[PDB]
Design a protein around this ligand. Structure first.
Ligand code: CL
Ligand code: MG
Ligand code: MG
Ligand code: MG
Lengths: 250, 229, 241, 196, 204, 226, 243, 195, 244
């Protein structure tokens, strides 16, 4: 046995292309649309819960994941690759930051750590790149609210708003017309729901849409009282009911 | 480095004209506490060898398992496992002696004194000693612990040198062994009345005697002894 | 065309070795079905003993992973047992480290993560199996979680796997469309097994004897498999109404 | 600590006091020293509490994994796993463990594993600091194939005396009964056993 | 032999109204022998100040280590580290040497640049944080400092009053310790100005 | 240090004093000894203070990751198993003696764990140099089916026994109450029976009392533009 | 194509061609069988006498594992020996930890997992043997057969090698004509016959019969080779049936 | 080894180091040079455990010479002293620490300043106008504290050094067989052959 | 076995070229142009972001210009993710040096270290090289202001003015035409922006498509200041130099 693939599986072609990264991006293109919009007092990330079967309980499949109390993530592309990246992202937030500084990492640095992991799968021996693009929304004290995209290459870019996957080209054009620097969180959620409806074929409701926000601190979700400085997580996943309420005002 | 915990006392043995005899009591001491009263310290290997073990009992049980594994291993891909390529006493001893010396050389000894008694393929008597240090020696009579100090003198009165061996019958040898066990019972505070005795003879093979007792004891003279002066 | 031999991306962004591992899944030509009751989770699987020289008691694709978790496998038996042994080891280690029994969904996720690794690391091939884990979880209740060679997993109200999964799936879909509940509203596991067998008969259009089926039942604090005579009693009850 | 296990007609019963001391201070007066490593394989622990707990947890893990693969383990198998840990790690352990279990084929069995990591199969076994005071009593009063009630009395009376003389032993007398009928826990309080 | 008292020296830190003060003696010695009267024990990384008493080689090593780490912190975070964060970094760094520790008694002092809140903290040689509101002491005359601080200290002292209080706490504590003295420095720290004062004291 | 844990009707309460010492010297007069492993699993530590803090945070960190991985709220038995196996591995060299208490989907729990890795179950426990003083109170007043209010009272009384009678313990009483189906309520400085009396004299100096050799501005700002 | 050039590669069918090619090596080997009797198992194998220079009864093929398990295989003999060596390590470690000798189903999986491991990587070649093995444990007699893929099942009778079809047909008759069961001594006789009958596929060269057995009554649950008079009696019985 | 002294004057650093090598009962040598040139304008004297002193000194010398060749540049005395300190600070927590105390006398050609660094085997570094290791400071520092001036000439430094050595020869029990004196300035390193 | 799938990233062609290095250089030729110009009183770094969007958050974005320490910065051309791996290593090297010698790392020593790391990937390990070219802008008290470049081969050279990425041939000719030795930073700023404006593949050069930095002794007295230009500051300098 032993892993005898100690050589790169991603290499430069004569034209300068890194084929495997391009092909990973193609897999992301086939993936279900997900988007992110940044407001003045929050960030919203959203995607469609494309249920593989009606017998499947799609609530048990979380496309939108909490990374830290103030950072959340959504993806387009290969689900299983995303799931393991979430596990690694959650851990690295502790091992390379919280266990050192006694606090959770700022969005940009956690993104940087996730980006590094994805870069290494692009150069390390005997592995393929991750077939996902991530959208990571978060808040921290000194940088405020932010939204980042991370690609299979490990490249990451900050966005005011963006979309990835299936109908990203049309969705991004839709977002360009609607986005301004004076949006409140509820306005961003409204735009998110509007944008997401265009790429969704079938049912469009709280059970088929997954949506989360990075907004105000939620002391009700902290689980304990007594420490004034601890005010609760800014990440909050919207319920099926909360989504449907906003679909009537749509 | 360790210390023995549960321990077995003397193993005694001698050669006679047609084979060897070996004996050891059935006690497992826990310091001065006579804790376990049914411990078999003579372990036969095949029908030609008996390994007698004193000292640490946990290590004895480990050695017992090594010997059991040695028999299994010898039988592998061996059509003559019950004939020409059966385990000899000399093979069993040399293996143990290797292990004992290796273990002491790693400063982690098997805390035992061992006597391998048996009869070789050609009928020759085999009797050799090995202990926790890897020290080995052979003699017409061999004994461990207290037996070395009390049994050997008595057994050497029967077989004092090599030329006494052919003159010594199995009856005389067994009688001498049994008497020595009685003497040890009188004088060793970590001995028991119950013991096992094994005879390996080139003609009659391996005779294993269990549940033997020290008998014909002299105690009557104690009644006359009064005070300390 | 070495992109078809190892788990790297094809120009279409596909992993062919993963796709071919899905095809190996149906090599046994066996169909399995899992459903949830009120207090139990039942899994049934076709049993085919094509050779008379076989000992039929050793022919099985249902595994007792832990006391609480059962697993049925769709795929070749070597890969099935590979996954079974690992799942057992993972479930035991979990209990030792964290002081409580490994939940069915957590085991499914763990085995799915392992599978995902085989789709990303070139030296390891995917296992050509689909793993359906069942239990009555102490927090979530009756549970069905299924894993595949892609490293995908999800919970199910009910599920079916095999060559004729679609027929069974649609049959189950239609029943739950009527009842409008996520489970079989039945008290005893015996009747939930009868439901499972009845609907497999309807979907496949075949009758079963006691030796044609294999049944696993999960209740609170234990998973167990039924004997041929237990299944016979089940088949008699089905025929008598 | 005073611990014992006794085989009888219908199976085996484990017994223990409940006192855990740090020097002369009783750190826990209601300790449970009867530990479950499998459904009908339990053990009595003496020596280092950290060591015996660590060992027992590892054994429980091993027997759980054994069961998943090979079905219910024998009491002998459980004793062997205990022994392997105790013997191989003798330099770093202070553990005296009695293993008791019920098979249907073998019925009640008792194995004692003292400090060195040796194994001894016995009709009954006593261990812990308090056992020293009841070697005489237990040897005189033990009979094979006792009834459940007789064995409960034998253990109750024995541990009563061990508790009476040993300062390291005390509290309640806990007992676990292992038979074909199942697993029964018993407890006996000072006001009961002190007047015996 | 005792590593924490070979070289000698002391650090003290105090909070005041919208300000913090940190002070140290200047002595480095080899037991009885005075070796240097210019061995400063207070360092700073941006606006966060760190005093370190104990074994002098470790004092130097830790200063270099925390300069190292706070420089990388700044490059990645794009901002200067804060006293609360740095305190956790010191604690983490010390505890990672749990079974081969730096023989030091570090003291953090500074003002949070965003909240404006004065902050001080102390540590034992393996990282246990003492986050006192009033004062932190460290070194071979820590007993003497505790005695001085406990009686001399009152809350909400103005910067120039706090200077006198901390100075007198250090000086008189140092004069009752053989291994402390030979000069002293006092930092008065406000949100965007820091003043450093060398004190005149007896040189025995 | 005095630390106690007390089970009650619908949960568990943990309490501690607030004195941390260096030998006979009081390092901190208002130390926080009640640590959070997770939102509803808290523990109090005696022994080497940094070993108690470090082992809490490490297991607390891993408990959080475990909770995220399994999509389940952390259990006290998990924290316990992880703590004891970590401590046992280090053979008592990590001098952490903890009382671990909490609520989880399984119910309410109370455990003690000692540096070598042995754990114990109980309805009432005490730890630290004032444990004997505390346990005297617990053994005198504990009963089955205590209410929340009774348990808080008993816990704080046990800590007070340590405060007054143990020289290793002092200052204030911290309490944390973990009730089933509720947020854990951390009550920092629940009792404050040791406020220092006003001093006889103000020791504020006249300005210019201290002799100064040199003054200088310290550049804390970065390298400037232009 | 090219899917068959590397082990552990799934073809578009979902097949591992390298494992299927290993089966060809097995099919090329001599005939070996196993018969499960009332209280034990019997193993027999065809040994082709390539030349007169071969010393009779010396090149023993059947192998013992521990003291209660017998193993016989067809195909590449060295591969079979390698598997048995592993089996012996597995059995030793099991007994070391658990005291009791390894149960036959437990042992079967140990071999099965090891063989299956050699279908997971391209850095190893699959085993070129099918192994028939078994013995007596606490739950009675067990007979197994293990293929290059790692697949194994329990059997009433088993056969592999060049004359497997012939052997299987003979085994199937025994199963039908004896639902109550076969005695150990009967199984030895029948094993001799079946090897003799299966030798028609290898009729060019003459052969040597080798039989072993584990039986609760006949061998005390230990694996033993059938020797001397009992072997000759089985050879006579076999020779009588072919004529 | 025994006595090593250092004094930084106006325009140079002077290092004085004893000549005796004693192995227990006998004085094996009375002309030993306890110093190594690390670079043209940097000199290091040393004292401590036998063997380790020379091994460490030559190891440092090799490293500085390697740096000099790689970069075609002479490291400043400060940079060299920091490198040396780290090596000793690394060494003190090693399996077997270097038991070596050093004085580094260098002339910084960039700043046109002499510099004297004292480093002990723990990695305790201090920059001084004058320094010593062992018991040498106990006898000499009272004289240096009195007479030293920062504007002293090299000749005055040597005269103050003579007074220090005389006091050592009077009150020290051990015969250290005099000292070898070396001067480090802008022109490099030279040895005073009559002292 | 595994050999079948090995591309062999570290082999010579028959002409004595390193395939992967050459192909990595081809990749870099499609990256946004970066320019460095060294003047007597400072250094200029100017770089073009690749076809951006209006929704990209520019003020928090960094793809071209990175700080290695207070004295040294780099301009990147190629795979950004690859660059960040090397940048972090370089930052650590600079701090290691500072801890060891208590002096800031000389520019060339840092450049040589990174270049050696790149070289290693071309000679051993069987891994693909880093698809990155750097322009290093830095200052030390030995050589003063310095410009270097390194490419995937691990070869590095010093420059008065240099470009990397797209249209380097056109850019270098333009720089060679207008560069003079007595040039000042403000003149170099203009040259850099003019050169990008002519060589760009975009229709026009705007602030949102640029990253800009200067290393000046225009720091109050005997010290050096790094200035990573803000979006508004890039917009102002574009108006000042008369490009927009
Ligand atoms: Cl995982
Ligand atoms: Mg693969
Ligand atoms: Mg008592
Ligand atoms: Mg003083």
């Amino acid at each position: 046995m032993t892993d005898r693939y100690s050589f790169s599986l991603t290499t430069f072609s004569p034209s300068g292309k890194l084929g495997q990264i391009d092909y990973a991006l193609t897999a992301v293109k086939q993936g279900v649309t997900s988007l992110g919009i940044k407001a003045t007092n929050g960030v919203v990330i959203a995607t469609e819960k494309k249920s593989s079967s009606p017998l499947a309980m799609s609530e048990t499949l979380s496309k939108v994941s909490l990374l830290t109390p103030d950072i959340g993530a959504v993806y387009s592309g290969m689900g299983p690759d995303y799931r393991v990246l979430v596990d690694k992202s959650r851990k690295v937030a502790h091992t390379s930051y919280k266990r050192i500084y006694g606090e959770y990492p700022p969005t940009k640095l956690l993104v940087s750590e996730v980006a590094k992991i994805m870069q290494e799968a692009t150069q390390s021996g005997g592995v393929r790149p991750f077939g996902v693009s991530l959208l990571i929304a978060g808040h921290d004290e000194f940088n405020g609210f932010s939204l980042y995209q991370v690609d299979p290459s490990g490249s990451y870019f900050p966005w005011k708003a963006t979309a990835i996957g299936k109908g990203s080209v049309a969705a991004k054009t839709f977002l360009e017309k609607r986005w301004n620097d004076e949006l409140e969180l509820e306005d961003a959620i409204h735009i998110a729901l509007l944008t997401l409806k265009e790429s969704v074929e079938g049912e469009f409701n709280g059970d088929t849409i997954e949506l989360a926000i990075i907004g105000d601190e939620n002391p009700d979700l902290l689980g304990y009282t007594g420490i004034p400085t601890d005010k609760g997580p800014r990440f909050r996943k919207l319920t099926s009911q909360e989504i449907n309420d906003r679909l009537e005002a749509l | 480095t360790q210390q023995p915990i549960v321990t077995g006392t003397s193993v005694i043995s001698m050669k006679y004209d047609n084979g060897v005899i070996i004996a050891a009591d059935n006690l497992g001491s826990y310091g001065s506490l006579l804790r376990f009263n049914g411990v078999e310290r003579l372990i036969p290997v095949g029908d030609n060898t008996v390994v007698g073990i004193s000292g640490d009992i946990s290590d004895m049980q480990h050695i017992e398992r090594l010997l059991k594994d040695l028999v299994t291993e010898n039988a592998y891909d061996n059509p003559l496992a019950d004939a020409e390529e059966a385990l000899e006493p000399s093979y069993i001893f040399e293996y143990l002696a290797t292990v004992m010396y290796q273990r002491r050389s790693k400063m982690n000894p098997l805390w035992n004194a061992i006597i391998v008694a048996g009869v070789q393929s050609n009928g020759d008597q085999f009797l050799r000693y090995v202990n926790l240090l890897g020290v080995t020696y052979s003699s017409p009579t061999l004994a461990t612990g207290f037996g070395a100090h009390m049994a050997n003198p008595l057994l050497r009165k029967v077989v004092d040198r090599e030329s006494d061996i052919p003159k010594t019958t199995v009856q005389v040898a067994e009688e001498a062994i049994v008497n020595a066990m009685r003497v040890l019972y009188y004088r060793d505070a970590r001995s028991s009345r119950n013991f096992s005795l094994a005879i390996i003879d080139k003609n009659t093979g391996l005779t294993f005697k269990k549940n033997l007792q020290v008998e014909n004891m002299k105690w009557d003279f104690a009644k006359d002894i009064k005070g300390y002066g | 065309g070495y992109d078809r031999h190892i788990t790297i991306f094809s120009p279409e962004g596909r992993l062919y070795q993963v796709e071919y591992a899905f095809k190996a899944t149906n090599q046994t030509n066996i169909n399995s079905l899992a459903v949830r009751g009120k207090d139990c989770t039942v899994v049934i699987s076709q049993k085919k003993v094509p050779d008379k020289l076989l000992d039929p008691t050793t022919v099985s694709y249902i595994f007792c992973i832990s006391r609480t978790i059962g697993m049925v496998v769709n795929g070749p038996i070597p890969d099935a047992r590979n996954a079974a042994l690992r799942a057992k080891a993972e479930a035991a280690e979990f209990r030792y480290k964290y002081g409580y029994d490994m939940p069915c969904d957590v085991l499914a996720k763990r085995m799915a993560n392992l599978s995902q690794i085989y789709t990303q690391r070139a030296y390891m091939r995917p296992l050509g199996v689909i793993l359906t884990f069942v239990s009555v979880d102490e927090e979530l209740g009756p549970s069905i979680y299924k894993t595949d060679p892609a490293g995908y997993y999800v919970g199910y109200k009910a599920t079916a796997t095999g060559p004729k999964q679609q027929e069974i799936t649609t049959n189950l879909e239609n029943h739950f469309k009527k009842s409008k509940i996520d489970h079989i509203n039945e008290e005893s596991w015996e009747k939930v097994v009868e439901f499972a067998i009845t609907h497999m008969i309807d979907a496949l259009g075949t009758e079963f004897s006691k030796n044609d089926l294999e049944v696993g039942v999960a209740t609170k604090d234990k998973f167990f498999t039924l004997s041929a005579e237990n299944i016979e009693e089940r088949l008699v009850a089905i025929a008598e109404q | 600590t005073s611990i014992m296990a006794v085989t009888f007609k219908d199976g085996v019963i484990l017994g223990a006091d409940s006192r855990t001391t740090t020097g002369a201070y009783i750190a826990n007066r209601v300790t449970d020293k009867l530990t479950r490593v499998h459904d009908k394989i339990w053990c009595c622990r003496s020596g280092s509490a950290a060591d015996t707990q660590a060992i027992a947890d590892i054994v429980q893990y091993h027997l759980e994994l054994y069961t998943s693969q090979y079905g219910t383990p024998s009491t002998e198998t459980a004793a062997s796993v205990f022994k392997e840990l105790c013997y191989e790690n003798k330099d770093n352990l202070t553990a005296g463990i009695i293993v008791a279990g019920y098979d249907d084929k073998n019925k009640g069995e008792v194995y004692t594993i003292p400090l060195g990591g040796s194994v001894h199969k016995l009709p009954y076994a006593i261990a812990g600091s308090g056992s020293t005071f009841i070697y005489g009593y237990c040897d005189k009063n033990f009979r094979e194939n006792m009834s459940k009630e007789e064995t409960v009395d034998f253990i109750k009376h024995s541990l009563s005396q061990a508790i009476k003389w040993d300062g390291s032993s005390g509290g309640v007398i806990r007992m676990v009964v292992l038979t074909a009928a199942g697993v029964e826990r018993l407890i006996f309080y000072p006001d009961e056993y002190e007047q015996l | 032999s005792d590593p924490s008292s070979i070289n000698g020296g002391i650090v003290v830190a105090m909070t005041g109204k919208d300000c913090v003060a940190i002070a140290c003696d200047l002595r480095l010695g080899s037991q009885s022998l005075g070796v240097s009267n210019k061995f400063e024990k207070i360092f700073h990384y941006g606006h966060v100040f760190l005093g370190i008493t104990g074994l002098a080689t470790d004092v130097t090593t830790l200063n270099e280590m925390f300069r190292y780490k706070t420089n990388l912190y700044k490059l990645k975070e794009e901002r200067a580290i804060e006293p609360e964060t740095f305190t956790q970094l010191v604690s983490s760094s010390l505890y990672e040497r749990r079974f081969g520790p730096y023989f030091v008694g570090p003291v953090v002092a500074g003002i949070n640049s965003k909240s404006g809140k004065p902050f001080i903290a102390g540590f034992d040689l393996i990282g246990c944080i003492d986050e006192a509101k009033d004062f932190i002491v460290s070194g071979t005359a820590s007993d003497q400092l505790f005695g001085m601080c406990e009686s001399l200290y009152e809350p909400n002292l103005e910067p120039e009053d706090l200077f006198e209080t901390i100075s007198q706490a250090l000086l008189n504590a140092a004069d009752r310790d053989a291994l402390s003295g030979w000069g002293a420095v006092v930092y008065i720290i406000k949100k965007d100005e820091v003043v450093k004062r060398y004190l005149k004291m007896r040189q025995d | 240090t005095t630390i106690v844990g007390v089970k009650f009707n619908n949960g568990v309460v943990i309490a501690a004093d607030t004195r941390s010492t260096q030998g006979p010297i009081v390092a901190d007069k208002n130390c926080a000894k009640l640590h959070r492993i997770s939102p509803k699993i808290w523990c109090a530590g005696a022994g080497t203070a940094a070993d108690t803090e470090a082992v809490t945070q490490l297991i607390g960190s891993n408990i959080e990751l475990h909770s995220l991985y399994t999509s389940r709220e952390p259990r006290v038995v998990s924290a316990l198993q992880m703590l004891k196996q970590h401590l046992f591995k280090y053979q008592g060299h990590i001098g952490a003696y903890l009382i671990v208490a909490g609520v989880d989907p399984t119910g309410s729990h109370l455990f003690s764990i000692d540096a070598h890795g042995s754990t114990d179950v109980g309805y009432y426990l005490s730890l630290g140099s004032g444990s004997l003083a505390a346990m005297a109170v617990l053994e005198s007043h504990w009963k089955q089916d205590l209410t929340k209010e009774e348990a808080i009272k008993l816990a704080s009384d046990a800590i007070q026994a340590g405060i007054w009678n143990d020289l290793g313990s002092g200052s204030n009483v911290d309490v944390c109450v973990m009730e089933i189906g509720k947020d854990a309520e951390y009550l920092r400085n629940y009792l404050t029976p040791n406020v220092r009396e006003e001093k006889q004299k103000s020791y504020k100096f006249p300005r210019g009392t201290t002799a100064v050799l040199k003054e200088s501005i310290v550049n804390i700002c970065d390298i400037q533009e232009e | 194509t090219g899917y068959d050039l590397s082990n552990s590669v799934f073809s578009p069918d979902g097949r591992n061609f390298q494992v299927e090619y290993a089966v060809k090596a097995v099919e090329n080997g001599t005939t070996s069988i196993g018969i499960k009797c009332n209280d034990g198992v019997v193993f027999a194998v065809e040994k082709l006498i390539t030349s007169k220079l071969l010393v009779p009864q010396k090149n023993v093929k059947i192998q013992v594992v521990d003291r209660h398990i017998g193993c016989v295989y067809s195909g590449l003999i060295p591969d079979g020996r390698h598997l048995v060596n592993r089996g012996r390590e597995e059995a030793a470690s099991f007994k070391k930890l658990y005291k009791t000798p390894i149960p036959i189903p437990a042992f079967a999986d140990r071999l099965g997992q090891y063989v299956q491991a050699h279908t997971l990587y391209n850095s190893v070649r699959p085993f070129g043997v099918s192994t028939i093995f078994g013995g007596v444990d606490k739950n009675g007699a067990h007979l197994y057969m293990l293929e290059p893929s790692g697949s194994y099942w329990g059997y009433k009778g088993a056969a592999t090698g060049k004359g497997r079809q012939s052997a299987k047909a003979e085994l199937e008759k025994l199963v039908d004509h004896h639902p109550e069961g076969l005695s150990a001594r009967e199984a030895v006789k029948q094993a001799a016959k079946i090897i003799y009958l299966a030798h028609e596929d290898n009729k060019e060269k003459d052969f040597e019969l080798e039989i072993s057995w584990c039986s609760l009554s006949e061998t005390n649950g230990l694996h033993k080779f059938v020797k001397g008079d009992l072997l000759q009696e089985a050879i006579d019985f076999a020779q009588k049936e072919i004529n | 080894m025994d006595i090593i002294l250092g004094i930084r004057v106006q325009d140079s650093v002077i290092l004085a180091s004893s000549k005796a090598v004693t192995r227990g009962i006998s004085v094996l040598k009375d002309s030993d040079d306890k110093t190594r040139q690390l670079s043209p304008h940097t000199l290091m004297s040393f004292a401590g455990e036998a063997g380790d002193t020379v091994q460490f000194a030559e190891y440092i010398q090799a490293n500085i010479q390697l740096y000099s060749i790689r970069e075609d540049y002479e490291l400043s005395p400060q940079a060299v002293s920091s490198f040396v300190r780290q090596e000793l600070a690394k060494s003190i927590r090693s399996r077997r620490p270097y038991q070596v105390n050093v004085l580094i006398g260098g002339y910084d050609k960039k700043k046109n300043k002499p510099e004297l660094y004292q480093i002990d085997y723990l990695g305790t570094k201090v920059e001084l106008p004058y320094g010593a290791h062992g018991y040498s400071g106990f006898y000499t520092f009272s004289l240096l504290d009195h007479h030293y001036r920062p504007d002293m000439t090299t000749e005055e430094g040597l005269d103050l050094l003579k007074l220090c050595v005389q006091e050592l020869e009077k009150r020290m029990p051990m015969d250290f067989k005099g000292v070898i004196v070396k001067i480090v300035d802008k022109d490099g390193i030279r040895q005073v052959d009559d002292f | 076995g595994s050999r079948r799938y090995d591309s062999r990233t570290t082999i010579f062609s028959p002409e004595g070229r390193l395939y992967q290095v050459e192909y990595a250089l081809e990749s870099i030729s499609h990256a946004g142009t970066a320019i460095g110009i060294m003047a007597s009183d400072g250094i200029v770094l100017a770089a073009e972001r690749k076809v951006t969007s209006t929704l990209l958050e520019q003020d928090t974005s960094t793809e071209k210009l990175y700080k290695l320490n207070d004295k040294i910065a780099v301009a990147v051309a190629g795979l950004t993710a690859d660059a960040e791996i090397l940048i972090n290593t370089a930052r650590i090297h600079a701090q290691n040096y500072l801890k060891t010698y208590n002096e800031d790392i000389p520019v060339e020593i840092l450049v040589r270290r990174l270049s050696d790391i790149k070289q290693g990937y071309t000679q051993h390990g069987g891994l693909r090289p880093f698809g990155v070219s750097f322009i290093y802008a830095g200052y030390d008290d030995r050589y003063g202001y310095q410009l270097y470049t390194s490419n995937p081969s691990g070869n590095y050279t010093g420059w008065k003015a240099i470009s990397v990425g797209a249209n380097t041939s056109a850019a270098q000719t333009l720089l060679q035409m207008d560069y003079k030795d007595d040039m000042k930073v403000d003149d170099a700023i203009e040259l850099a922006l003019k050169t990008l404006s002519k060589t760009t593949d975009s229709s026009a050069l705007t602030y949102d498509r640029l990253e800009f930095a200067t290393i000046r002794k225009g720091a109050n007295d005997g010290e050096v200041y790094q200035k990573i230009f803000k979006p508004q500051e890039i917009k102002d300098i574009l108006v000042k130099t008369g490009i927009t």
